[PDB]
Every structure is written in structure tokens, then in C-alpha cells.
Amino acid sequence: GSSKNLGGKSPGKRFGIKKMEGHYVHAGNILATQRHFRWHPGAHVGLGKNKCLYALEEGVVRYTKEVYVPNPSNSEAVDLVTRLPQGAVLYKTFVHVVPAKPEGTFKLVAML
Amino acid sequence: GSKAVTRHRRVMHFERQKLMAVTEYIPPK
RNA sequence: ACCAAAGCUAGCUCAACAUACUAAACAAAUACAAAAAUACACCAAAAUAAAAUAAAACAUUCACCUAACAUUAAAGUAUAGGAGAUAGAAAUUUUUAUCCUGACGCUAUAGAGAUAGUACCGUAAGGGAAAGAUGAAAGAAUAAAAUAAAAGUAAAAAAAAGCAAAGAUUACCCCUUCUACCUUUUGCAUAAUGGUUUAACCAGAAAAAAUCUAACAAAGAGAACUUUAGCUAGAUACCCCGAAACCAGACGAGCUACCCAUGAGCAGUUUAAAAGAACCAACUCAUCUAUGUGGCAAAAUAGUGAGAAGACUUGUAGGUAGAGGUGAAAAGCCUAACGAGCCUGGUGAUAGCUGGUUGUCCGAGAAAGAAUUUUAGUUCAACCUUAAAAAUACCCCAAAAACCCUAAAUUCCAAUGUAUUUUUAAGAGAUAGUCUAAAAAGGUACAGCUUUUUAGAAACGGAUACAACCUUGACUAGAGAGUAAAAUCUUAAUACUACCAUAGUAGGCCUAAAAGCAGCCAUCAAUUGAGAAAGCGUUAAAGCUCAACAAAUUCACCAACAUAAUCCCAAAAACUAAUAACAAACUCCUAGCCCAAUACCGGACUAAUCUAUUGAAACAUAGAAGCAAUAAUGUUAAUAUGAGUAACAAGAAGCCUUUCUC
RNA sequence: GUUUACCAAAAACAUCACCUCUAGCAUUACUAGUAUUAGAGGCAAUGCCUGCCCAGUGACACCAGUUUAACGGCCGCGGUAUUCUGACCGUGCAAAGGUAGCAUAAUCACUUGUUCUCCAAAUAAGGACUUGUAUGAAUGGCCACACGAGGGUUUUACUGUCUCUUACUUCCAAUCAGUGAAAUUAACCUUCCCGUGAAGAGGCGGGAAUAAAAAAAUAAGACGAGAAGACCCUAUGGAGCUUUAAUU
RNA sequence: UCGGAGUACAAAAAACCCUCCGAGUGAUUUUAAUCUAGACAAACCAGUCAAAAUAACCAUAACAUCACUUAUUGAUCCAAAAUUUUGAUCAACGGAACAAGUUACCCUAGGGAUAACAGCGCAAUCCUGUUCUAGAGUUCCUAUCGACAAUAGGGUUUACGACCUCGAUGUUGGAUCAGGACACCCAAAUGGUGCAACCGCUAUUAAAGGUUCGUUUGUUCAACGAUUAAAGUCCUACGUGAUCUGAGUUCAGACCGGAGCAAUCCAGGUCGGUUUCUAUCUAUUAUAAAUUUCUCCCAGUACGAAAGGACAAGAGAAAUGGGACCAACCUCACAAACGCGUCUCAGAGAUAAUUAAUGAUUUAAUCUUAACCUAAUUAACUCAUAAUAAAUCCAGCCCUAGAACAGGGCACA
RNA sequence: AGUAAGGUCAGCUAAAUAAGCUAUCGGGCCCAUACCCCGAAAAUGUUGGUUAUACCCUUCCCGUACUACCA
Ligand SMILES: *C(=O)[C@H](CCSC)NC=O
Ligand SMILES: [K+]
Ligand SMILES: [K+]
Ligand SMILES: [K+]
Ligand SMILES: [K+]
Ligand SMILES: [K+]
Ligand SMILES: [K+]
Ligand SMILES: [K+]
Ligand SMILES: [K+]
Ligand SMILES: [K+]
Ligand SMILES: [K+]
Ligand SMILES: [K+]
Ligand SMILES: [K+]
Ligand SMILES: [K+]
Ligand SMILES: [K+]
Ligand SMILES: [K+]
Ligand SMILES: [K+]
Ligand SMILES: [K+]
Ligand SMILES: [K+]
Ligand SMILES: [K+]
Ligand SMILES: [Mg+2]
Ligand SMILES: [Mg+2]
Ligand SMILES: [Mg+2]
Ligand SMILES: [Mg+2]
Ligand SMILES: [Mg+2]
Ligand SMILES: [Mg+2]
Ligand SMILES: [Mg+2]
Ligand SMILES: [Mg+2]
Ligand SMILES: [Mg+2]
Ligand SMILES: [Mg+2]
Ligand SMILES: [Mg+2]
Ligand SMILES: [Mg+2]
Ligand SMILES: [Mg+2]
Ligand SMILES: [Mg+2]
Ligand SMILES: [Mg+2]
Ligand SMILES: [Mg+2]
Ligand SMILES: [Mg+2]
Ligand SMILES: [Mg+2]
Ligand SMILES: [Mg+2]
Ligand SMILES: [Mg+2]
Ligand SMILES: [Mg+2]
Ligand SMILES: [Mg+2]
Ligand SMILES: [Mg+2]
Ligand SMILES: [Mg+2]
Ligand SMILES: [Mg+2]
Ligand SMILES: [Mg+2]
Ligand SMILES: [Mg+2]
Ligand SMILES: [Mg+2]
Ligand SMILES: [Mg+2]
Ligand SMILES: [Mg+2]
Ligand SMILES: [Mg+2]
Ligand SMILES: [Mg+2]
Ligand SMILES: [Mg+2]
Ligand SMILES: [Mg+2]
Ligand SMILES: [Mg+2]
Ligand SMILES: [Mg+2]
Ligand SMILES: [Mg+2]
Ligand SMILES: [Mg+2]
Ligand SMILES: [Mg+2]
Ligand SMILES: [Mg+2]
Ligand SMILES: [Mg+2]
Ligand SMILES: [Mg+2]
Ligand SMILES: [Mg+2]
Ligand SMILES: [Mg+2]
Ligand SMILES: [Mg+2]
Ligand SMILES: [Mg+2]
Ligand SMILES: [Mg+2]
Ligand SMILES: [Mg+2]
Ligand SMILES: [Mg+2]
Ligand SMILES: [Mg+2]
Ligand SMILES: [Mg+2]
Ligand SMILES: [Mg+2]
Ligand SMILES: [Mg+2]
Ligand SMILES: [Mg+2]
Ligand SMILES: [Mg+2]
Ligand SMILES: [Mg+2]
Ligand SMILES: [Mg+2]
Ligand SMILES: [Mg+2]
Ligand SMILES: [Mg+2]
Ligand SMILES: [Mg+2]
Ligand SMILES: [Mg+2]
Ligand SMILES: [Mg+2]
């Protein structure tokens, strides 16, 4: 007969994880890009409008499993928490960047 | 080449045939 | 020993100088149909060049391409361009005369086409060759000297067997081992392409950026420019053959289509007929068949046919010319090819397409991701080559990477093992893939099928033969040695035989009839022993047999599956001792010059020419190029094979030229 | 009568006839003519006929409009007389809805339609039946005389066409004498069978056969020789023809 | 062209004329600024995020939101608008500023990279055999058949793939000559039967020989007439055109119907239409030892209620095929050749299915991949037998011998 | 096979404002029937989705239509 399926061709968006644990990253480097929320941002990690994770401070990237406390203004998320049984807590994975360089140091500029 | 599952007792690779012949069952004597 | 071989002149090429540029010969005849002494005339003319090509198509555009007055610079700048391809000035600058001119140009397939625009092929425009060799004397031809070396033959035919050879061997064969060579492909002994063989001739060319060497250096360069180590100079580079076509100008209607002039043919026979009537010759066309097919003939011969007083055949001569002529339209004919002639010029037209591409040796060495009137091609990325700089590359433990279920396993990373990797500067090729194992998809859970991902391979050994499977780190020499993959695969299977039968009772029900034996229901009971029945049978009965008596005691689940076409296919073998043996490009042993390859790239040497200096029985260091041919249905010339084969011709006798036969 | 000189001589073209169209006129055609003339075309004598349609296109008028012997066109759905058929009726669209005639034809397919005659036997031939839903009226329909190197069928007569080949002559042929060519050719010391293999082997593998040469024959193979396949596809390769392609 | 899910199971990437959903924009107001560290992605062109800093406004305020939110889009040049800015189903969506048909009148460069014919691969389709019995067969599975299903093999048909050939592998049917297979049509032997006999149905074994002549069609096929012991199936480049045929397909001409405004087109029909080759090599160029039908007879017997009606054995005559010959007839104008005419044509061994005897494993029985002996029994095949037979005159002439070369005669002829 | 394309009252048409004609049903006129006049009833093939429906899309079903070519 004839083909009925159309438009199935599309290149991948290269969504995935960029920096593994232990990689030394600087401020602005994109830790990971994702379609849905696969890894939630953690300490010293921002979040762009396209749900990409970028480090805010120079340091070492670390991955961690932590608890999830949703924003009360998010109606869908708080509803899921409400229906949970008393003995359960949500767990999500997070990406952290432990700072390495200190904020600054004091040096002698003038001795009057 | 043929599929993984066929209807005609797919002929094994010659190296695999030696494997099937050296791993036979020898009943105790 | 024939055929052949050798020679160095003829002359030519590119300049320079230069008079200033249609030669030589013109007695007579020369534009009547040229080379024919002699009569009232006409005579003459101009209209932009177009296109093949480039823009990967093609419409605007496309250098030079008729007419510039040059050189050093301004400058490939200003501008003009489907602003694409490419096209491209000027203002303003520079330039000292005459001699010193000859040759790192050829030597008879070269150099002009040339011994010559002559032979010869074309009606015409036009195309256009091959061809020379003695010596001081050939007024030394019983003449002399020289290579006796190409293919092809002769001297001298051949003796089983094989890409014609190698290993050898006392010995030519006999033995053993080897699927011609290029091109083109995933893969060719292939029955895919090309070549009969020999000689001669025939195909890589450019310097912007770069690397190597050198001069001078914050400056370099013999003006005009470039400059934050640069500038100047040298060296290192990019082919040949081929279309159908397109445009312009010439020459062709002596063949043929049609027409205008001027002529010439149609006998007999039949009819008041010279009626596009009738029979049949000359004459003109060419229906059918057979010979012929490199033929007698680039369209014919033999037989047979149609017209034959007309819209008919035919001679001479003239007219219409390619964007056209002509046509009783067949897209016919216009000089043996006309969906539009031929010749020359534009022309070395242009081809992503086919074929070809000439010495030795050595180093490293790539199968496809993305766009594309693009998938027969290009331009990028990856990979790779040459040179250079730098520091980290592979392997990589623990930790770490998602939410319903989910395998093999990947990503990332210290150690460790090992030398690899990145960056910078130059680059081309490739971008048409085949199978095996693994995970999938389409299909017939078909294909030597097709589309992707991971991995492997493309032995001169093994699977008899064999691109893809297995053994293998591809050097040279040896008449040494150890080993790896590996050589005939299993079963071809099933005997089951004694003895013996009687009770209630045709159990109830059911049905035409149901007596163990359609069905329903129940399944008790005599006898030590035997089921209200396991099978067969009867319309229903009867009857046979099997369970139970006794007798008696090898073992007994299961395992059976037709055939193809030229002629079956190593020969053969059940036991003398087997973790044997024989067996490679692997690995040891003795010496070394110390490890394969297609496209592309790198390096070292070198045959033969000329020139600058050496050399002086034929070379050395350098500088230059018409610098190397087993392959283009290659060119010219010469040789073979087919083959002494196909095919060709003269009537007889005699007294020789006269009589006979047709 | 004419045509594809060199594979088609015909059913093609031409042709007398009929019809449409354009032109009122002078020194080179038409024409030394003047609408009973002359050109641009169609269709094919004669005979009987040539039906309906200017909506579209074209032409004319160049305005309304007029023209089909100008290019061209010339219909559905549903019901209805016991059954069948459909005179008739409802409804819709059109510029009109295929009229006369002929017909399984040279006429898509169905197709070897059905039937009769011809034959011992008929996918042939002739005569009828006939929606041919794709026949059809000067892109002409239909009928007939004569004519035809056109195409098909039948009877009669003849015969080597054939059942079934044979005899004898001439040109070829083979031997002798003379002259002496062509396509072709990688090298060949040039076998058969099965198997293998770029999938059809003289050459590889496993086996068989095997003194060497000459002359005369038959054509199975050498994917025989001949023409860089005419079929097919590809090429940002050509050309001829047509127009409602683009530019002009 | 762009996005989402599976193929792509766990970092990324990853294809098909693969399987399923979408997009070529709306609604609303929070109308969303300037400037810069660092990165994801990627051939390129493009696409994406983004701290700090400045301005805006709670006076130390930057993510427009929702619809699977992911896609909702277009490069230069050029054109228009104020200079801010805008412009394409350029959808062939990395886009030529603007361009359709047909060629069977075709041409050129190439491709077996790519089709038609043939081989090969494969077996969907096709063919052949077996396993399984529900049932058909009055009762009765398998005398003859056998649904729903199982399994093995053949390579004939139409397909599928595009692997060898497009610097050519010539293509249907006939004519000639046939080579081969057996899944056998006839001829021979045999088992079973719903087999009395006759005529049949079915199965096993056997391939030496044989398998007709005509009307229509180009036909293979098929229908029909007549006959035969039977008019087999199939392979061989659906054998065979360097042997022939060209009616059909399959060029250029021409009509009819249809499609197209036309040029032209139609696996739609009709009429016409060049069939080349001198053989280099390989291969090859005569032994025989028959086969079938019909008649008569057995016999109107066997067998059957009757109707019907045999086999074996015996005898004879023809036909085809192999190999020969002219007395006659006939072809016949040579003394010969020739058919339409005449002549001749064979014994033994050996077997397959199947049938029977003796007999053990199993003291019965049982034809025995149990032994010994022995019997009835297809065709091939093999052989008896028959043909051939002398080594070494050969110039010349003749010949019923012959292409050449050979061979037989030449004493009485 | 593929593509194209349609279904609406009993029937045929036009619109989606489901209308018009006819048929069918009731009544009147006439001696009766028909004509004629008057009144009433009647449907969007099918499934799902189209803000909600209909003209649309989708599914199912019937039937219609073109093409099937070069060797
Ligand atoms: C099929 O017809 C084709 C020829 C086309 S041109 C007559 N066959 C070729 O072999
Ligand atoms: K070839
Ligand atoms: K080729
Ligand atoms: K070649
Ligand atoms: K003339
Ligand atoms: K001649
Ligand atoms: K190309
Ligand atoms: K009973
Ligand atoms: K004629
Ligand atoms: K009109
Ligand atoms: K008829
Ligand atoms: K004629
Ligand atoms: K032959
Ligand atoms: K494009
Ligand atoms: K198949
Ligand atoms: K071919
Ligand atoms: K036979
Ligand atoms: K040969
Ligand atoms: K005779
Ligand atoms: K037994
Ligand atoms: Mg993709
Ligand atoms: Mg996807
Ligand atoms: Mg595979
Ligand atoms: Mg161009
Ligand atoms: Mg080009
Ligand atoms: Mg020009
Ligand atoms: Mg401009
Ligand atoms: Mg010369
Ligand atoms: Mg020379
Ligand atoms: Mg010589
Ligand atoms: Mg040898
Ligand atoms: Mg090979
Ligand atoms: Mg190939
Ligand atoms: Mg290649
Ligand atoms: Mg070859
Ligand atoms: Mg080729
Ligand atoms: Mg050749
Ligand atoms: Mg330079
Ligand atoms: Mg041009
Ligand atoms: Mg011209
Ligand atoms: Mg003339
Ligand atoms: Mg006369
Ligand atoms: Mg006459
Ligand atoms: Mg003529
Ligand atoms: Mg003649
Ligand atoms: Mg003749
Ligand atoms: Mg004659
Ligand atoms: Mg005549
Ligand atoms: Mg006549
Ligand atoms: Mg002229
Ligand atoms: Mg013309
Ligand atoms: Mg004429
Ligand atoms: Mg014509
Ligand atoms: Mg024509
Ligand atoms: Mg000519
Ligand atoms: Mg060229
Ligand atoms: Mg590719
Ligand atoms: Mg590159
Ligand atoms: Mg780990
Ligand atoms: Mg590391
Ligand atoms: Mg390519
Ligand atoms: Mg592949
Ligand atoms: Mg494959
Ligand atoms: Mg392929
Ligand atoms: Mg790979
Ligand atoms: Mg080997
Ligand atoms: Mg080694
Ligand atoms: Mg018992
Ligand atoms: Mg059988
Ligand atoms: Mg053998
Ligand atoms: Mg060894
Ligand atoms: Mg190497
Ligand atoms: Mg290659
Ligand atoms: Mg030198
Ligand atoms: Mg040279
Ligand atoms: Mg040479
Ligand atoms: Mg040739
Ligand atoms: Mg050559
Ligand atoms: Mg010579
Ligand atoms: Mg010779
Ligand atoms: Mg010869
Ligand atoms: Mg001769």
C-alpha cells in the first residue's frame, strides 16, 4: 500500500549528565541538561528556565539522595504529599557543588 | 543472515559446535 | 642464410638587425566556357559579429576574442557585477643612444604540410601524403666497404600430462608445486574490459600562504612596497585521447523533388474512339519467391509480375540553397549517414561519464557522520601523512548517573602496567562494502535479501577446491629444529504363544424389538472361581474374545518416514601398544643489509641527453629539460596467424592460323 | 495514377464531385487575368441522406450579436401494466441530451458473445440476433456497378508442397598446374566426468582417459566472429515536434 | 521541514517507502531592559542556558503564563518604511529572481552500480510422500476417500532478491536430431478389494523399446473428428536460429475505438515489414546377438441363478525397428542406382516386488539384515555364439573399390 | 491492488435557518374516480471526536469511479 506514518524523523537533543562526581568545575559550567526533572538542583547549583543545572561556585560536583519538601504554592506537588501515608517520605536525587576556593583573604596593603 | 529464532534448527558456528561436543554428558561407569 | 640494420645532409624553428613591404617571369595570348587579335556600353552595393563556454542549470552577465601608443609603479586599488560567476580603470609616476646576434632549437615517424600545396581523394568550397644515404674518383659495377643484432622464416616438423615455469636432476621430458597480465569492482582464472607480435612516436604545467637553505637585520629590497623578527633571493605545484551538438561565412539542383525553355519516342491487335477503355512488345516502374550477404553489385542477377496514347516515359540546358529549397505528407528528397546538407573557421568547444598515464628501492597508511536539482560529484567534521611544540594519554578500584518492571553491559575516575596523547603549521585521498558471531526491524520466525548499533576478518598453512570461518608480530640467506589450526561424523533398534468360561437375570427403565453390549438408572448377588460388562457381532437373540478359576513362571516402557534429470565418485581399512607422529608468513638455531600491502602523503638513489669546468679506450661535481612505455578497440611503417585456404581464366583439331562445334 | 532511392507500394496521399473561407483589382508571381474569376483548406465519384447543440474556445462583428460541411459536444436517480419488459409518471442538471442508419465490425475489455449454413471434425469465412454504456452522419453515415501485384474464405482443375523420397545432367565440389584475399588472434604443450567457484570450467579440487601428425565431413561448446546494445535506467549531456510552460 | 514515545532496555549518538501521535498557532497580562564571567550543543550556518554588574519598579524587585510546552518556523542578496523596523505553502522548507508536455524519427557518453530474456539464491505460491483419526462409505476409521492439524523432501509455475553478462548471454511456436530422470501412459511380474467371471479402483517392483494422423487458432494450451497396446509427466540456456522457418511478439508506414487543446500515447485490435559468417581449437563421424499387436485354438470351457464371459499353454499371419538385395513389378533414353518391391532377425546365466518349503533365538508357531540346502519368479545387464585375421608384388591399365590416400583384379579371359 | 469519491423524509433535490416538490395519511368539492382546494405527519449512511452541534474529521458498512504501463 502506502506509508501512513509521517514526521518520525528528529535528531536527539543530547539530554543527559555532563559532569560526574569528582569533576572540578568552575562557575557557569552546565552540570546537566534534562527534559523532565531527573536530578534536582542542590547547594550552589542554579536552575535555568529550560531545567538545566549549572554550578554557581567553583568546586567539586557531588551527587546526593535527600528528602523532598515541595513549595506550598505548587498545588500539584503539595497534593501528592497530602495523600502520602504517615510512614513515608519522598526521596529525590540532588546535585551539589562543595566550594573549594575560599571567599577571600586579608593582605597587608599599607602599614602607616 | 537469519533471525535469532528460526524453524530449521539453525546451524551453529563451527567453534560453537566444538563447544557443544566437548561439554557432553558422560554417565558414570 | 634471407627479410632487414647503420650514416648526415637536405632543410626547418625561434629571435635580432633591417631596408621600409604583393617575389621571380611577362615576346604573344589572358574575366566569350580565362590564356581565343578586331564593334554602339549600362555600371555597381552597404546593415552592430554570433555561439560553443563559465556561473557546476539557465534567461541579466562570461577576460582575450576587428579597431590600444609601449615599459616600471599607482593596483588587482577606486568602481562596475541574478552585488553571484567574474569584469576593472585613471589622476599621478618610471624608462641613455650605435656596435657587441646568435642558439644548455630539431636532424628524415623530429623540424614547416613540403622533394609539395605537387600526386591523389572530392561536381565544388575543401582535404592532402609517403618518399633521400657507397667512395677522393663509379671517365674504379669480373666494383667496393660496412652491422649480419627487431618481429617473421630457413638451417632443424612432432611423441601421454595441462597458464608451459619453477624446485631440481647424471638425464630435454617423465616427478613435485603453482586459477595469465592490466583496467574495473564488495568480490574477477573468470565465460567482464583491452592487447597478433616488433621498431619509432605519445600523457603533471603555474609559487598567494607555507616548510628547507642563505644574505642582511629593527629594519630588508638595485625607487614605487612589506615591517610589534621581520624582509629579500633560491628550491619544493596542480595530465593526455574522445562526443551528439551550438554560431557565423562559403560552396553544391551534372544524383534526386518540382518547374521554365527546347527537342525526341509509343510497333502490332481489338473498337464509330488517341476512351486517364482492352490484349501484348520496345520502353518505365519493382509485386512475390529463390540465389547473393567483404556478393557481379556500398541494393544486383534468374524466374514471375503492374502500366504500356498518358496525371506517360526521355535527351540537352536553365531556375529555386540550409532560420531554407522542394514535396499527389513518406517528417520524403537536396551527390552512397538528412527529425535537417557538406567544408572551413570559432576549436586544443565542453563533458561529475569511459579508457590511458612510462626507472629502482624504502617509511607510514584510510570503508563513509553532516548539507547539497545531492546521493555516478563536491565542500566540511572524524581518521590519516609530513614537520614542530608541549604534557599527559590508555588500562582505570571504591564512590557516583530516574522516576512503575527490566539482560549483556556503558559513562566517569586514583593506583598499576605501558609510551602514548594533545596543540600548532602544511596537506591530499575516501565519502558506491562484503560476510561471519551478537541485539533488533521489514519479509514468508524466505533469500548469497534489506535498513542500523557493538565486535572480527580479507595466508604463500588448515576446512579436498574456497575473498569474509580457524591457526598466524608477513625481513634476507641455510640440504637445521620445536610447535599451532587441523584428515573419514554418529546411530542406522520393536516376536509375545497357555488354559478357561457356569447363577439369580430379558436387572429396572426405555423402544416396533433394547436378552452384558442406542440411551436413562442402578451396579447388588450363586459358586474356590467369573465385570448387570472390556471388545467384536445380531433387526433384536444366538455366537466369538478379554478380565476372574486353576495351571504356570527367561525377558518384554518406548525407540520404523519416497524420488531428478551428461557418469557413481580418492582408493581402501573393525586391534603390534597414541596426551604418538607428520604438519605455517608463527618461534628458537647459524650469519646478517633486522619485518607485507591498494588510494593519498614522505624519503633516499638513478638510466639516457645538452651546457659550465674536469675527464680523453667514456667519466667526475654541478646547472638545465621534448628526462624513461608489457597495456588508451592508441598513430605511422613493417611483419605474421587465418592460408597456400576462399576465389579467379583459354571451345576443339591442324598443314598455325585454316577448317569445324555452338 | 502517387509515395518511404537502399527492410513497409498499402486500407496511406492525390483525384473528378460537393461544401466552407478570403479578396472590386494593373505594368516581373497570382495575370498581360477581373467574382461563371483567383487564392487559403476540408471531405472524397455517383445514389439515398448529412439530425440536435453558439454554454466554452476560436473567428467575425471587432457593440448587442452572428457562425459548427469551425475546433468540439450530443445525460442521470427512482417508481410504474400478475411475472418479465417499461408506453408512461415523479424529480434534477444541461448549449443540446446519440436522431436516421449500420453493427461482436480493422471498433478497449468481457470474447472463442449466441445461433444457423459451409467441414468427418470450424478460435477461420459468410448470414442473422444485438446497449456499440467506448458505433454514428463532409474528423462524414449507409448502399451499389466497375476496378485491385492490398487483406480473408470456398469450389473446380493441376501438380514432389506432402504420405516418402529417388534417378540423371550443368555450375560448385575433391585431386593436379598458375595467381592468391578477408573478418580474427594475450600466451597456449588447446581432453571427459562430478564437485567447487564473480552463482554455466580445456586450466581449480577429487577422480578418469591419453604414441605423434595429414586430408575430407557434421555445427553441441569456446558465454563463437561482426556493431563502445537499438530495449531499460542514469547524465543539473543534446536535438526534433506541440502547447494552456517561462522570457520576448 | 520541525517536536514527543517505541525500534535505540542503563552516558551520548544511531537507520528504513519502519510502527503510532502531533506542529506551519491561539488565549491572557505579569508587555518580559542594558551589559558581561563561565559552559552545553555543533562540519559549517545556525540554536541554547547564564552568575556578577547597571537601570526599572516591594525603594538593596528579571523565568511572561497556560494548552503532553517539546514544534509553532526561512539564509544572503534585494525591496519597502522613520534612520529604530517589516517582507515568501522560497513546503523541492540550507531557499536557482523569473521556465511545462512528448519522442516507436531519435542521437551521444556510460551502467550488469539498474530492469526485460537465461542461470543462481530462497520455497510464499506449486508439487510429491508420510504421521494423526473425527467423519463419508447402509453396519464397518484407513477397498476407495478423509475436514481441524503434524512432519519430511522435490525445484516445473507465478513471484521475491538484483549476484555473473548492456565495448551485446539473439527473444514464442513449429521442422530436423534427440540426451536424461521415474513421481510409469503401454508392454512384463505381484499384493489388496465393497475382487465370482468380464470390465474396474488402488498399492509395490521395473526406464532396454514405444508413445498416431487430421479441422480451427501464430500458437504451447484447449475443443472436436478418426484410430491405437498407449497417444505419460518433466528437465535439458522452459535442449536445438555459426542447421532451417518469422505466422506472432519487437523499430520506421496506416487506419478503428478511447485518453490528450495538441505533439503523441494504449499487456487493445488490424494490414505491411533485410534473419549475416569462407570452421582456428575442443568434440564427433556403423558390429551383431529384435519388440509389439491381431487372428485361430483352448471355449461358449473355467466362473455364474441367469445374463455374461477368462487366464495360462499351442499354432499362424502382419506392423515398426536393426541389417541387407534387384529375378520380377515400378522410377528407368548407361551396363546402374532406387521403393512402392523382395529377403533375414536368436540360445544361456542373472535378478526387484512377491510366493512357498525346512527351522532356531521363543524345544509351539514363524519364507531366514538366524544358519545349511532348495523352489516359483520383471526388465536391464553379462555371455555363449557370429563378424574381423596371410607383416614387407605393386610402375602401368581396369574395377559392381574410391573425395585424396587406400583396397580388389591384370595365368587360361 | 491503490487512489478518488458519495450516502439526508417512502422518492428526488437545495440548504444545515433541516427547506421545496412529489408520494403517504385525514377532510372538502363530484353521481363516483382523477384533477383541483385545505390540513397534518415525516428524515442528516454509520462510530468517535469536533466549546456544543451542523455542513467537518474519524470508525464501520453499502455502493460508485479511474488507473494497472516500458521491455
Ligand atoms: C522487447 O521488446 C525488447 C526489444 C525492444 S525494441 C524492439 N527485447 C529485447 O531483447
Ligand atoms: K562483455
Ligand atoms: K566496463
Ligand atoms: K585495459
Ligand atoms: K541549375
Ligand atoms: K554488377
Ligand atoms: K553527478
Ligand atoms: K441396552
Ligand atoms: K502499386
Ligand atoms: K460562441
Ligand atoms: K459476421
Ligand atoms: K493495389
Ligand atoms: K560447434
Ligand atoms: K533542494
Ligand atoms: K522467495
Ligand atoms: K546484455
Ligand atoms: K523413454
Ligand atoms: K579450445
Ligand atoms: K527414380
Ligand atoms: K520369528
Ligand atoms: Mg535520524
Ligand atoms: Mg525519534
Ligand atoms: Mg547477522
Ligand atoms: Mg553553464
Ligand atoms: Mg564542469
Ligand atoms: Mg562573447
Ligand atoms: Mg543596482
Ligand atoms: Mg618529414
Ligand atoms: Mg626520428
Ligand atoms: Mg631478424
Ligand atoms: Mg608436467
Ligand atoms: Mg580467485
Ligand atoms: Mg558488480
Ligand atoms: Mg574503490
Ligand atoms: Mg577476458
Ligand atoms: Mg564494461
Ligand atoms: Mg579482443
Ligand atoms: Mg610564497
Ligand atoms: Mg546557446
Ligand atoms: Mg548555421
Ligand atoms: Mg537538373
Ligand atoms: Mg499502339
Ligand atoms: Mg489502357
Ligand atoms: Mg520510385
Ligand atoms: Mg529481374
Ligand atoms: Mg527471378
Ligand atoms: Mg522455373
Ligand atoms: Mg499488363
Ligand atoms: Mg489494367
Ligand atoms: Mg548558389
Ligand atoms: Mg522547412
Ligand atoms: Mg511526386
Ligand atoms: Mg502521417
Ligand atoms: Mg511519423
Ligand atoms: Mg549526404
Ligand atoms: Mg576534454
Ligand atoms: Mg555512501
Ligand atoms: Mg578533511
Ligand atoms: Mg567503578
Ligand atoms: Mg586518568
Ligand atoms: Mg559517492
Ligand atoms: Mg553492507
Ligand atoms: Mg547482504
Ligand atoms: Mg545489495
Ligand atoms: Mg564495522
Ligand atoms: Mg589451502
Ligand atoms: Mg617473524
Ligand atoms: Mg482369562
Ligand atoms: Mg513412490
Ligand atoms: Mg573414482
Ligand atoms: Mg614445520
Ligand atoms: Mg609497510
Ligand atoms: Mg577497494
Ligand atoms: Mg648529472
Ligand atoms: Mg616524454
Ligand atoms: Mg615500445
Ligand atoms: Mg574489435
Ligand atoms: Mg598499443
Ligand atoms: Mg620500418
Ligand atoms: Mg601464408
Ligand atoms: Mg580452413
Ligand atoms: Mg574453389
Ligand SMILES: [Mg+2]
Ligand atoms: Mg494502381
Ligand SMILES: [Mg+2]
Ligand atoms: Mg522502400
Ligand SMILES: [Mg+2]
Ligand atoms: Mg517493396
Ligand SMILES: [Mg+2]
Ligand atoms: Mg447535394
Ligand SMILES: [Mg+2]
Ligand atoms: Mg460519399
Ligand SMILES: [Mg+2]
Ligand atoms: Mg483519401
Ligand SMILES: [Mg+2]
Ligand atoms: Mg475515409
Ligand SMILES: [Mg+2]
Ligand atoms: Mg453534422
Ligand SMILES: [Mg+2]
Ligand atoms: Mg454568444
Ligand SMILES: [Mg+2]
Ligand atoms: Mg443488421
Ligand SMILES: [Mg+2]
Ligand atoms: Mg460495416
Ligand SMILES: [Mg+2]
Ligand atoms: Mg472488441
Ligand SMILES: [Mg+2]
Ligand atoms: Mg486469419
Ligand SMILES: [Mg+2]
Ligand atoms: Mg485454412
Ligand SMILES: [Mg+2]
Ligand atoms: Mg456478420
Ligand SMILES: [Mg+2]
Ligand atoms: Mg464516440
